[PDB]
């Protein structure tokens, strides 16, 4: 079940009421919101895109920080087993929470090496008029509570707790966070370097791919692929609409996206028309694009 | 975020 201050969380319940009734949750939200956004470099960084999963442990000599950004209606979820330090960061967008939460639990439960407990952290979203952030909170908290293992909710800064306003337009306060694998510290972060195959991985998400695990902790390898998707519908119609038309239909929050969001969409849409059948083309021998950290902490092809 |  899902525990807070040692007691089971009653559902359904808004995260605002849950945070208001438990001082440790309220304190954590105040600290996280009051932080300045840290510009995290690429050294030892494993950036997690939307609808992606990454899990590692402090025994990893290549990954120091897991991070994700550009969360408007989605939620960044961090599951950590204290003691052994097995840490999993996912960027959930409400596509299939019934299957994504077991993916998070199995990524951590596979680490056998009593000591410590399971702690979960939920950050992201705002008071969007489509209610996508509130439904993701309801879904994530419900499926974590259905697990048989005791999961202790430590961080909860979602929806109305993560909402700011600027001339009657609402948008998130925290767009992204980073987690230090060794010290378990979570903080607001921005990422200028977001790893290799960004457009290929963004196209896989735009085409409708499910949540995937992108990192193999044993070999310390970033494995990208092989991917296969159906041709995106009307790629040239969407590529020729104006920036307002693209935000209203291809984004979940047309007025809350970070700047240059339409630049990223058009780049992603051009990739899908460039590669409608990518399985046999971008992956030679049906093998994944494997990357490893090098001496300077940057991803390099192997 | 990316929509449907």
Author numbering:
A (entry chain A): 2 to 114, 117 to 305
B (entry chain C): 1 to 4
Give the original sentences from the paper that presented this experimental model.
Although yNta1, NTAQ1, and NTAN1 do appear to share catalytic functions commonly involving a conserved Cys residue critical for the deamidation activity, they exhibit low sequence similarity to each other. And we explain unexpected substrate specificities of NTAN1 based on structural and biochemical analyses.
